[PDB]
Design a binder for these strands. Structure first.
Ligand SMILES: [Cl-]
Ligand SMILES: [Cl-]
Ligand SMILES: [Mg+2]
Ligand SMILES: [Mg+2]
Ligand SMILES: [Mg+2]
Ligand code: NA
Ligand code: NA
Length: 326
DNA sequence: GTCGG
DNA sequence: GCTGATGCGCA
DNA sequence: CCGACGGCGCATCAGC
């Protein structure tokens, strides 16, 4: 990988600011730099060169200078050698333990995995499930399994009502060889911006996936978003597949393109597209693209008939999902 | 941390 | 209950 | 040279 050194460096630092320093802005700042640099088609040979790129500033350039000179960064070596920092960072890897909780747990001497398993009682349900499948959630999902999981989900959706449409989004939709989790966008005719008089559209689908033992646990669940756990069925005498995170998001059918755009990501792409829409005087969310009022407030949703249409409004060359990755 | 008001 | 803030998610 | 930075769903707690 071309500038992997640098981008691993910046990505490790971002994680440090988010998880340990709880500096969310520095987090984004490192993330922005890392994306632009990873996109940069020449091997970077100095800090000054990188500083031309948007979102690289003086300090990231010093850091690139150091790393190019020595193959490491001292700041990161300090961080790597601080048990406290390192235990904080590590707890955030549990699903449902973010920066606050991680920090609190460490402040009362919960520093290891063994410690968490001995204090289940201190964990809410989400954290308790995060911990239970901690090792499973660390693994990636090969595309060939994602294809099995998709087949399973679309099959059951169809079974509940053939008018549902389910679309596997995220990295999968971008053509990744492996995904972190499974992201499913859901639409039904009876759910539109103009209204829902029909009850339990998401519920019916979650219930049916539990009925067939695909969904095994629920992290959080509302009327439009489900966050939970699933598992492919294994064969006799072969060890089980790991459990996997699954997110299902019910979007109004008439807002499908904004939704699919949102759920396809990547998260950096989304944030840069939304940032760009603003420079052009629009605001994009998963539901709509709207123009900006001078008073700050957003006006009315513009009509969209394709993903392509959203890019057009902000005057971007359409980018296929595979080119929305990092 | 960066870029821009 | 509510509104709002915060925490932890998602892309 | 301080001070915004995409946007939002769900869970939970504070102060009504
Ligand atoms: Cl749309
Ligand atoms: Cl909206
Ligand atoms: Mg992700
Ligand atoms: Mg995903
Ligand atoms: Mg996901
Ligand atoms: Na720059
Ligand atoms: Na976490």
């Amino acid at each position: 990988t071309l500038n992997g050194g640098i981008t691993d460096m910046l990505t490790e630092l971002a994680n440090f600011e988010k998880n340990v320093s709880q500096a969310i802005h520095k987090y984004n700042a490192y993330r922005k730099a890392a994306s632009v640099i990873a996109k940069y088609p020449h091997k970077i040979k100095s800090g000054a060169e990188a500083k031309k790129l948007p979102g690289v500033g003086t300090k990231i350039a010093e850091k690139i200078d150091e790393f190019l000179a020595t193959g490491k960064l001292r700041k990161l070596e300090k961080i790597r050698q601080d048990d406290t920092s390192s235990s904080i960072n590590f707890l955030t890897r549990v699903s449902g333990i973010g920066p606050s909780a991680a920090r609190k747990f460490v402040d009362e001497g919960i520093k290891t995995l063994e410690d968490l398993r001995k204090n289940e009682d201190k964990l809410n349900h989400h954290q308790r499930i995060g911990l239970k499948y901690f090792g499973d959630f660390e693994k990636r999902i090969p595309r060939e399994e994602m294809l099995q999981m998709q087949d399973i989900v679309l099959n059951e959706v169809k079974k509940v009502d053939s008018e549902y449409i389910a679309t596997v989004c995220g990295s999968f939709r971008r053509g990744a060889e492996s995904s972190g989790d499974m992201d499913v966008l859901l639409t039904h005719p009876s759910f539109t911006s103009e209204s829902t008089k029909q009850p339990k559209l998401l519920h019916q689908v979650v219930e049916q996936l539990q009925k067939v033992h695909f969904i095994t646990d629920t992290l959080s669940k509302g009327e439009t978003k489900f966050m939970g756990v699933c598992q492919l069925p294994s064969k006799n005498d072969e060890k089980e597949y790991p459990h996997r995170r699954i997110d299902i998001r019910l979007i109004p059918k008439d807002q499908y393109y904004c939704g699919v755009l949102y759920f396809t990501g990547s998260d950096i792409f989304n944030k840069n597209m939304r940032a760009h829409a603003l420079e052009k005087g629009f605001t994009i969310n998963e539901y709509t693209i709207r123009p900006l009022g001078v008073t700050g407030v957003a006006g009315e949703p513009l009509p969209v008939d394709s993903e392509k249409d959203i890019f057009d409004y902000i005057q971007w060359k359409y980018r296929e999902p595979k080119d929305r990755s990092e």
